[PDB]
Design an enzyme around this catalytic site. Structure first.
Site, PDB file in Angstrom:
ATOM      1  N   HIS A   8     -20.746  13.545  14.459  1.00 59.02           N
ATOM      2  CA  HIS A   8     -19.654  13.786  13.552  1.00 59.02           C
ATOM      3  C   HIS A   8     -19.661  15.242  13.241  1.00 59.02           C
ATOM      4  O   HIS A   8     -20.898  15.806  13.320  1.00 59.02           O
ATOM      5  CB  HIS A   8     -19.546  12.996  12.342  1.00 59.02           C
ATOM      6  CG  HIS A   8     -20.550  12.842  11.512  1.00 59.02           C
ATOM      7  ND1 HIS A   8     -21.625  11.876  11.664  1.00 59.02           N
ATOM      8  CD2 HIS A   8     -20.847  13.488  10.040  1.00 59.02           C
ATOM      9  CE1 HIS A   8     -22.453  11.835  10.606  1.00 59.02           C
ATOM     10  NE2 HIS A   8     -22.072  12.775   9.697  1.00 59.02           N
ATOM     11  N   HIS A  67     -18.545  28.594  13.600  1.00 60.77           N
ATOM     12  CA  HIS A  67     -17.348  28.278  14.049  1.00 60.77           C
ATOM     13  C   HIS A  67     -17.180  27.051  14.859  1.00 60.77           C
ATOM     14  O   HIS A  67     -18.361  26.805  15.592  1.00 60.77           O
ATOM     15  CB  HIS A  67     -16.291  29.420  14.531  1.00 60.77           C
ATOM     16  CG  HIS A  67     -16.693  30.007  15.780  1.00 60.77           C
ATOM     17  ND1 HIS A  67     -17.259  30.921  16.036  1.00 60.77           N
ATOM     18  CD2 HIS A  67     -16.038  29.347  16.972  1.00 60.77           C
ATOM     19  CE1 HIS A  67     -17.381  31.254  17.409  1.00 60.77           C
ATOM     20  NE2 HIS A  67     -16.643  30.188  17.917  1.00 60.77           N
ATOM     21  N   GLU A 106     -11.303  27.319  16.290  1.00 60.28           N
ATOM     22  CA  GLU A 106     -10.777  28.007  17.495  1.00 60.28           C
ATOM     23  C   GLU A 106     -10.019  27.019  18.453  1.00 60.28           C
ATOM     24  O   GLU A 106     -10.835  25.973  18.352  1.00 60.28           O
ATOM     25  CB  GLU A 106     -12.031  28.853  18.360  1.00 60.28           C
ATOM     26  CG  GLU A 106     -11.662  29.437  19.467  1.00 60.28           C
ATOM     27  CD  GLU A 106     -12.737  29.775  20.143  1.00 60.28           C
ATOM     28  OE1 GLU A 106     -14.082  29.948  19.401  1.00 60.28           O
ATOM     29  OE2 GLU A 106     -12.853  30.297  21.509  1.00 60.28           O
TER      30      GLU A 106
END
Lengths: 129, 129
Positions: A8, A67, A106
């Site tokens: 997770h 990211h 992204e």
């Protein structure tokens, strides 16, 4: 003895209801649980946990150094670009964007194998293993 | 139109060679590419990219607001605890730890379904969807 899979991800967020609208409505994730300060989603097959921290400073830069990218089909690129634009998402092939707090995200249309093959042509002085 | 899967994660790191030893040797990931400022791994079936930023301040708190958890089998808990301890990893069922820079990581032995069932018993005033 290897690690098996990603389990997770957890993000801290300043306003749970803004973040539920982002992850559930904009990104089309599934809401599975809420508490006063918590929400769980399944998004792209991944468990995402949100932890509300109402005091993360709004006047400072945070979230700079990570990211997270999700896969979309190449044919879905214009659909997602337009969906994020029409929802006033902060937008920076790939689409780079942030959640309401600034976590960097992204959408990407390729695989690791595709990227390695791209660099073998574009950046041939890298070292490939 | 859903997002399909997680594609990759990128972390900024201050020293590539320290981070390659962590992700490759300690966490048993596969090194696939290096450049002067880049390394790619496959770890737990996930593409991880490292971007070297030698100037991330060492005297400030960063990386506070995200964590990434990987799945291990319950029977592997003591093996991983001991492996991280014997490698002088910063350690904070689950094992919570950081990479050399401070990115927050976790090894966890359960599923989302297991956690929802746990909360239905332990935190019954949450709302389940």
């Amino acid at each position: 003895h290897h690690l098996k899979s990603i389990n997770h991800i957890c993000f801290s967020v300043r306003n749970l209801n803004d973040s539920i609208h982002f992850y559930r409505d904009i990104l089309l994730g599934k809401l599975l649980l809420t508490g006063k300060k918590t929400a769980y989603f399944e998004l792209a097959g991944l468990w995402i946990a949100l932890n509300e921290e109402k005091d993360i400073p709004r006047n400072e830069i945070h979230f700079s150094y990570t990211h997270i990218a999700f896969t979309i089909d190449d044919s879905e690129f214009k659909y997602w670009h337009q969906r994020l634009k029409d929802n006033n998402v902060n937008i920076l092939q790939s689409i780079y964007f942030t959640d309401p707090d600034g976590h960097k995200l992204e959408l990407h249309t390729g695989t690791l194998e595709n990227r390695l093959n791209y660099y073998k042509e574009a950046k041939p002085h890298m070292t490939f293993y």
